[PDB]
Design a protein around this nucleic acid. Sequence first.
RNA 1: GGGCGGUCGCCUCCUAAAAGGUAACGGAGGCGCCCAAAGGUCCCCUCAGGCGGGACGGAAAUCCGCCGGAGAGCGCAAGG
RNA 2: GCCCGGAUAGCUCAGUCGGUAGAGCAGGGGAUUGAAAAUCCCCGUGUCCUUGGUUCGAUUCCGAGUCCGGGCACCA
RNA 3: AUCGCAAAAAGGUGGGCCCAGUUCGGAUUGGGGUCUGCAACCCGACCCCAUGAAGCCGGAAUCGCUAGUAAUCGCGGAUCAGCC
Lengths: 24, 71, 87, 179, 118
Amino acid sequence: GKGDRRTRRGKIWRGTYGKYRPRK
Amino acid sequence: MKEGIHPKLVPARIICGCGNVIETYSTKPEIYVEVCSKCHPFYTGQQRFVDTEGRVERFQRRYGDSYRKGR
Amino acid sequence: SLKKGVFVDDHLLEKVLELNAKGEKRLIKTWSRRSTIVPEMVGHTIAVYNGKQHVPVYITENMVGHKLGEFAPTRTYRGHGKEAKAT
Amino acid sequence: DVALKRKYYEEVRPELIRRFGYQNVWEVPRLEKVVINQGLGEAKEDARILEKAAQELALITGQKPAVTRAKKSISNFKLRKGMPIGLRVTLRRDRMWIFLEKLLNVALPRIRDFRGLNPNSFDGRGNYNLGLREQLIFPEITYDMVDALRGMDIAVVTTAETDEEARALLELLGFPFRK
Amino acid sequence: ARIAGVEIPRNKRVDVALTYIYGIGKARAKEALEKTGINPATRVKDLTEAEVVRLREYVENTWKLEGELRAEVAANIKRLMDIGCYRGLRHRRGLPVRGQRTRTNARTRKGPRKTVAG
RNA sequence: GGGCGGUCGCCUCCUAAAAGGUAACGGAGGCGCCCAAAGGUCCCCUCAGGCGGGACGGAAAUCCGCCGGAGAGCGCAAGG
RNA sequence: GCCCGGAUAGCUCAGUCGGUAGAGCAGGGGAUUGAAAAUCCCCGUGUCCUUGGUUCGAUUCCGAGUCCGGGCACCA
RNA sequence: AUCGCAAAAAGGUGGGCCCAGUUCGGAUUGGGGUCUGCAACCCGACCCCAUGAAGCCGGAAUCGCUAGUAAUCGCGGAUCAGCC
Ligand SMILES: [Mg+2]
Ligand SMILES: [Mg+2]
Ligand SMILES: [Mg+2]
Ligand SMILES: [Mg+2]
Ligand SMILES: [Mg+2]
Ligand SMILES: [Mg+2]
């Protein structure tokens, strides 16, 4: 989901990746 | 006495946390931990929560001296 | 989301801390809250524009890393109602 | 049988000498009875009485408490005559120390409040209701019969006159201080 | 298949039934199993009956007991009003306290369509 | 004075004048019942309030200690 | 006192010929109609008389009557 | 214009989450750690964390859509530091 705190595309819609799901 | 509804309170041993627990009276042998947890004048039994566990770079003195520059 | 640089405004950084030189009356007039309240002096009363007017704040030793940004009364909300809807 | 009885006999009886007491044999203060009450908690837990607090209370101290009646039908709190609502028990024996040494050592930790209870809860003639809050979480009961918060109320009655003569006993027996 | 916590989600995947234990979430039920070696696609019911009971002490080591931090949800609101601040009656009047709009959207802490006269 | 209105029997207090009785369209009130226990015998206990407290609790729920000799209660109005 | 037909939601009512159920108001805003009336829409209120029994049941059948009526007596 | 933007998205030949108010789903939340930036609170993205209330397709009939048209998915700007 887009509006979730952490999904696949929830980092895309909100701008940056996570501290458990990094860039690579 | 009144033998009847009143149970016999069958013996069961508690797991001896802070010294010997008061002995086998009830059939409930389990605690979480630490029967006394301190000697009970409450000798600061802290686990360092949201308060001053992290004391570096805050609750400290930064940005120069003791601020003589005021006036 | 606070960082290693605890910023106070250069207009208001050390011009609140005139108490620590000698010791004076328990009021001094700062302006901002986006700047951090000064951690050098404790226990006294700091005058501030608290959102509505220049009314002071008084700490009671409960702040370790808590933000002063929750101190802003200017929305004197009396209660609900008084709407006159459908317009 | 023996449960902290050495602290009962040589931490009380010679400790009440040289600073307290008239130092004869019986006016040294001691324990007579410790009443324990439910009092329905807040209000009536059910329209008809269920008698299960006698079962879990008979689990925690192994005896049935008497379910006693109600007073005159004032009917502001739907008060009524009959259908008993008391749940009071004194039960003074060495069976007093059987449960009182359990709750003496398990109830000051394992429930969360400010550390201890009032030294201002002493009353005239030394009878001292202590007044714990709930303790249905960790009286080693493992969540048995979780109906409500459903606390209880304890009063440990001393013998002597003054609050300094019950205060002479109770925290030398192991109670906290200054809340 | 008993769990480390209290509310049992009735025999699901180890990524699912172990998760909504209090004190546990996605990034604790995801890393708490790959260290112990359990494949995250397996069931809690299809776990080893010794892994049922020995994966319980690992959860109860550091964080404060279930219901106590939920009481710190109401106690942090108490300690922020150390002098009775304005954020306290930001909280106790039934509204979000971040600073959302409250005529439209952010209808959550307000009672849903509760009170108007006109 | 009659009519209109009120009342027609029983119980309680006063009027009722320290034995009993005693009137008025004199004052204040109740009743046409109810309890297989609200009965008999035997065996235990003493109430209502006030003070000091409590975990909720109205200042009244339930519990402890002291004072409290009958100011409670005795199915129902009043008297004993 | 024998016999006769029934007691449904502040109000009263759609009922069964044993397997069903409620619509209307002082009520708030509501596609409406170009923002006007409310035509029309969600909606606040069933011991279906008290109780026993064929019955898969009872929101409905049958028996005593406590609830109200007409006829019929009978009242020393 | 290659070099690097970016990851094109269901492409997965995948293991599973088993009718569930449920890892489908979701915000408000008070503490810590990184800021591009005088400075992010009450006006940083919201970053692993806390925690996840509402929802099983809606009424009196509306309203963007005729074959590359709906529909989730995928990319950049424009004042531009986050981005509101
Ligand atoms: Mg859940
Ligand atoms: Mg006489
Ligand atoms: Mg006479
Ligand atoms: Mg009698
Ligand atoms: Mg729900
Ligand atoms: Mg963009």
